[PDB]
Design a protein around this ligand. Structure first.
Ligand SMILES: *[B]([O])([O])[C]([C]C1=[C][C]=[C][C]=[C]1)[N]C(=O)[C]([C]C1=[C][C]=[C][C]=[C]1)[N]C(=O)C1=[C]N=[C][C]=N1
Ligand SMILES: *[B]([O])([O])[C]([C]C1=[C][C]=[C][C]=[C]1)[N]C(=O)[C]([C]C1=[C][C]=[C][C]=[C]1)[N]C(=O)C1=[C]N=[C][C]=N1
Ligand SMILES: *[B]([O])([O])[C]([C]C1=[C][C]=[C][C]=[C]1)[N]C(=O)[C]([C]C1=[C][C]=[C][C]=[C]1)[N]C(=O)C1=[C]N=[C][C]=N1
Ligand SMILES: Nc1ncnc2c1ncn2[C@@H]1O[C@H](COP(=O)(O)OP(=O)(O)O)[C@@H](O)[C@H]1O
Ligand SMILES: Nc1ncnc2c1ncn2[C@@H]1O[C@H](COP(=O)(O)OP(=O)(O)O)[C@@H](O)[C@H]1O
Lengths: 537, 139, 264, 538, 70
């Protein structure tokens, strides 16, 4: 029957003769098996899978850097450094031309907060080379099985993703993007990363061997791109064989540009609402500042989506012909009362308040740090779900201030006559780390001093007893947030000067960066020199 | 506007939900011309068991005036559970949408699907994959 | 079929006193029970016509109140503050209580509070420790009182930081003796500065409070954005106060002249 | 062979053709296989399972009627109301069997400590309908897998609790008792309780089935009864679907009647000592009180049983001609020295101590709380193996007293000068909960006040910090245990008022209940007017 | 004395289904053969130890053997 037709099919679909041999034996050895036998079902499915996966099929594929250069420009805004870097990479892969005949595939990672376009570029490249794009995501995958699969024997047996992807793509040479590269839970039963190496070692991969199939399969052609939010969660073996591109977020201007060129028209068009609605640029700036909080734009698309969709509903009811076009005042109508309306800080300096920034893979945030000096016995209380390493920095900061009673404007006997409370809202979300060493020191002096502190400035650094600010991480991520926030007057450890080169250059003269090498200078810059409140006694 | 009427008619309360459906639909019509544009979202009506997720299906169907039929995925084990096991030589038929597909005569109807979250996965014979084929306009 | 029916408030009473879930499913059953207890009533005995249920008649239909009204004690008290909480099932109205007793600044927080909530009591105590004169507190209560903050019931476990302001209100009326109004219910987070942060689960709390029968509320500005989720009909009878700062709350709540002698 | 032959019979039993055909298929495969080879043998085992599971081999369902009422009356003493409720439940069942819908009934659970004869009530209802009877005890099951069972040719799989029971039962319509429903762990691997809903909602009840079986079993035909010692650990998805009948325990005078009418001559017949041995009515009592601290009769059954055993051994060593009867005097011969002062904890004004109640699914317990005021720095120690919430209850109770020194005339200077120790023996048993607030308010207040506290009253309430006294759990269970212990006064929060209407009159008749909404009332009621010990200091 | 130590599967207790010589009857029958007679005391040592992992659960078998009804 259709199995006889299947015999004809297997041949038509080109594949190595060993595969023919194995497959034909399977076919023959099946007939006998009486149909409906669970074994029968399983054997048949294997046959079917074997036939559907792209063995020899080809796809017209091209590589002009310049043509591709144009495309990337065609489908993305800015990212000049990031764009150029890609071609600089891509280029060398051109020399290999297969044919190096060694040293191919030092593969890519795209790193940055989510919503920064990483996958979109992937999608852009693979059309740029007029070849197929597929998304395999590796988020929190706990097992090897997922990649190299479980043997055909066991119940609910299925080939790994890698095979799954290849059937579905329909050809032997697509761009494949493995994102959530670093969201792999690891080796809790066994290492699954390994199987990846099997995937991405050029020598190794030519005969990639899934387990559900019993045929080595070849992934030699495939192009691989990876995505991640940080590199601290990749095993080193993968990590040593990657070239790193960082796409670390956009700024309100960069976002506003992106929105009108790409995000706003898609959503109008997507909505079927083309030509009946539009937003002012002024409006959009309202959407960035007051409805979203993130480094990369995957909030703006979501909100600009809400508007476009609302519009359709409205019009059919409905109340326009031609454009209703929108501006700021017209936003809460579509989108609801603003989320982040302040009014901040106010920046009119306050007593025992200092502005610190913080970051994580999903982005950098701007968080305030508050201290209260109250009369009491010298008990210190540290709330805000502070981790322990942060609590030690309170101590270091507090202890530095303790020794230098005179130099700064401190009461000389707080240590046994006041109690400090150091708080860092919000209450729920955990916070840790020592990069906000100085910033607790500035807050504490204000409290004790009674001297207000500047709240235009937002600052970062670590502190020791000696009083030396020390280098710290996440400089670009944090400073973006300052910029987005509407802060334009940073503070930084000297030894973190270097990290400024990685910043996109435009912002740099949009930011005033004081490099401090010791603590004293932070305070001086931040503390007004006449106190407001009466001292605590 | 017409479909706006029903929901008020059949379901009480739920302004927000009532709206959010409405926008899905509205945007539906506009896009209808849909070339090359319609790869439109499919709807989920997430809710804790015991607050009439299904009715809102029927409120629409009446509204859209096309037939209504429902089928329950959760506790589903077979790919051939979603298409005939085979023509002849298993004890066999075509189900589970297909037969039920001809329960209501028309080509244009509405099906609603529920407890897709709950359907059997590893136990055997994935249909969870089958569905993607099942819904995608592409094939 | 035509044998029996329920007064609509009587339904109101089944929901409230016999249901505590998000779902209908509790309801159907209860509604289920009534009907088939009609039959034993009708198998026990026959009646001609329609027997019509009012709230009071419900308890005989397998009823007892096995949940009970959150209806509140409106008259003001000293060392208490209304509060709003939220569970996946629904929104609860909880009350907070504080004690002013002779002591040495020891602070106890009981009622199975969680670490985050506890911290909310420390932030709020510390903020009041700075502004004593400003709220009419003793200049140095901190040195000569021990203080205890309780949220009954004891069995049920609690957490979250949206309570700060309620605790602060409670705490203030503890040391000052000025009674704290209990028309009003408060959900708000507090910074050590006395700023009122936004909070979560706003729909459920106010509903919980509305059904309680209090129509006066406090809430952050930041949370105003989320008053578009409550149905209007609820909103018609809601006296919301929006606050950017905690001092705005105490002035609004604490009655003008104290009622009880100081600690001694 | 007849192993072929067995094949032939397998048509006999009566699958729907669907199941029959499926069966035939697997049987063929079986033949194919090495036969005998490992998979072949497991195939045989499935085949056997599959075939011998009960398919439409029902037995005549006797009807409900008054009669079922009377089968109850002989098999148990008392339970006036419970029986009615059982009966009333069944009346409705008929109409549902009048078939307005096929079925929409609620399953039921019987809740009471161990020994109250839940497990046998159902036994004697099955008898009412002539239906076979089978018990499944569900506690303690980690895994949803036991109820559902495993894969068919996994290879390693057994079907599970329902199939075995059913298959065993051998009929289509047996009664089944799901014992200790409330003890299912619901951990990972997965949650069994969910699995039940299929079992117990008709909707799936009629279709779905064990994972080892590959075919629906109509469990609509079965009749289900449930058993639990407490309602709080039964999943609300499960709880919502049931109708509850509550069996709390027995007072001593009831316990005598169960004992003489039912448990004494049951064991006597079993021992084979019928009419050669007998026990005095006041001899049973000594058995009840001196030899058993428990809320149900399993402990009585066990010791009355001990008399027959010793009764039988003795005879064979000897003789009456003759007839032997035993009164209080002649019991410790049979059992031993008693090991219970039956009544009482000494019910006299004691300084620093109060009488509290507590409970478990196991039963209720009287419990005495002790406080010592000893001069001090202001330290609280909370011995007695008190879980956290109980300690916190002691604090909140202490605070209210701290506020109101003037009112209850405690010493104003205590908290610097006085260390309070709160203890709740026995010390080796974990105790916990807020319903003892007032009891510690009383106990502590007596300790500083120096006024004895009445101990003819037992009490339970939670003391909110204002002083309010808050409604409370397990009312019936704590009140019963207080009858048995010989305390006949109870302090109880007002808001607990409703739960009294569900007290057996028997208990209700013997008690005085004070309802308090505030905690002055307690201290006013319990505390004697003038102290009996010089104050703690100065 | 029958010894139920780590008795794993109903192969004993309940006999091997007789499709080869290698297969043999459950221990009980081995027991009843050795003692001449039908009424010998039998003691099943270590009843707690046996567990049911792979081939049915012995305990079920044991119930049948010890159930006066069946
Ligand atoms: B610092 O270590 O670079 C900084 C610590 C910090 C100080 C003050 C307020 C917030 C954070 N780190 C972060 O911002 C940390 C990440 C971290 C922690 C420890 C060591 C290195 C890096 N991020 C957060 O704590 C955070 C981020 N976003 C929201 C809330 N908290
Ligand atoms: B607040 O953070 O939104 C609030 C804290 C609270 C309010 C009133 C009384 C005690 C605590 N949180 C809650 O409502 C919490 C649940 C919660 C906690 C953290 C984050 C989100 C939500 N509510 C409770 O703890 C609780 C306890 N018992 C019954 C109902 N809710
Ligand atoms: B109360 O919560 O109903 C009560 C308080 C109490 C008083 C005296 C001794 C212990 C506890 N608790 C109990 O009844 C508890 C069980 C409990 C705990 C928390 C909430 C509800 C119920 N009972 C016991 O601890 C206990 C100990 N030993 C024997 C019997 N019960
Ligand atoms: N630089 C950019 N220019 C234009 N569009 C962008 C840019 N970055 C992101 N987007 C748009 O925002 C959406 C989210 O980007 P996405 O590809 O999901 O990024 P990531 O994969 O890093 O989350 C995409 O649909 C993309 O079109
Ligand atoms: N009220 C009663 N009247 C007569 N016999 C009873 C009564 N309560 C219990 N029994 C007997 O005592 C024994 C213990 O009851 P049991 O069914 O084990 O209780 P449980 O349901 O808690 O397991 C049973 O054998 C039963 O015959």
């Amino acid at each position: 029957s259709d199995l006889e037709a299947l015999r004809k099919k297997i041949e038509e679909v080109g594949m190595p003769e060993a595969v023919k041999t194995k497959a034909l034996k399977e076919l023959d050895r099946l007939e006998r098996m009486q149909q409906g036998s669970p074994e029968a079902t399983v054997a048949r499915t294997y046959l079917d899978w074997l036939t559907e996966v792209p063995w020899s099929k080809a796809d017209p594929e091209v590589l002009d850097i310049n043509h591709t250069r144009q495309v990337l420009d065609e489908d993305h805004y800015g990212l000049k450094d990031v764009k150029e870097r890609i071609l600089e990479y891509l280029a060398v892969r051109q020399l290999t031309q297969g044919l190096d005949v060694r040293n191919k595939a030092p593969i890519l990672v795209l790193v940055g907060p989510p919503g920064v376009g990483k996958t979109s570029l992937g999608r852009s490249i693979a059309r740029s080379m007029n070849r197929k794009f597929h998304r395999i995501s590796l988020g929190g995958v706990r097992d090897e099985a997922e990649i190299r699969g479980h043997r055909r024997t066991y119940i609910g047996a299925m080939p790994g993703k890698l095979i799954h992807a290849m059937k579905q793509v329909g050809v032997i040479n697509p761009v494949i993007l493995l994102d959530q590269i670093d969201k792999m839970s690891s080796d809790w039963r066994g290492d699954p990363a390994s199987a990846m190496l099997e995937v991405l070692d050029p020598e190794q991969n030519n005969t990639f061997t899934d387990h559900y199939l019993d045929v080595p399969y070849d992934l030699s052609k495939v192009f691989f791109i990876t995505t991640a939010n940080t590199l601290q969660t990749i095993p080193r073996p993968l990590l040593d064989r990657m070239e790193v591109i960082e796409i670390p977020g956009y700024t309100n201007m960069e976002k506003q540009a992106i929105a009108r060129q790409y995000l706003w028209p898609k959503q109008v068009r997507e909505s079927g609402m083309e030509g009946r609605i539009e937003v002012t640029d002024a409006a959009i700036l309202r959407v960035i500042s007051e409805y979203t909080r993130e480094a990369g734009v995957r909030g703006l698309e979501r909100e600009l989506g809400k508007i476009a969709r609302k519009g359709a509903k409205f019009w059919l009811e409905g109340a326009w012909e031609g454009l209703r076009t929108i501006d700021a005042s017209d936003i809460p109508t579509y989108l609801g009362i603003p989320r982040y309306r302040p009014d901040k800080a106010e920046t009119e300096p306050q007593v025992g308040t200092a502005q610190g920034l913080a970051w994580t893979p999903v982005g950098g945030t701007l968080l305030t740090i508050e201290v209260a000096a109250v009369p009491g016995s010298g008990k210190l209380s540290l709330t805000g779900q502070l981790g322990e390493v942060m609590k030690e920095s309170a101590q270091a900061a507090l202890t530095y201030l303790r020794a230098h009673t005179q130099d700064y404007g401190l009461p000389e006997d707080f240590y046994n006559k006041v109690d400090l409370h150091v708080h860092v809202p919000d209450g729920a979300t955990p916070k840790d780390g020592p990069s906000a060493g100085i910033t607790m020191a500035t807050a504490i002096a204000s409290a004790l001093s009674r001297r207000p502190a500047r709240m235009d400035i937002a600052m970062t650094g670590e502190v020791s007893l000696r009083g030396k600010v020390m280098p710290i991480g996440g400089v670009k991520e944090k400073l973006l947030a300052a910029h987005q926030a509407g802060i334009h007057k940073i503070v930084l450890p000297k030894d973190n000067e270097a990290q400024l080169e990685e910043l996109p250059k435009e912002v740099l003269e949009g930011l005033e960066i004081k490099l401090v090498e010791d603590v004293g200078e932070v305070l001086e810059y931040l503390l007004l020199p006449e106190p407001t409140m009466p001292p605590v006694v």
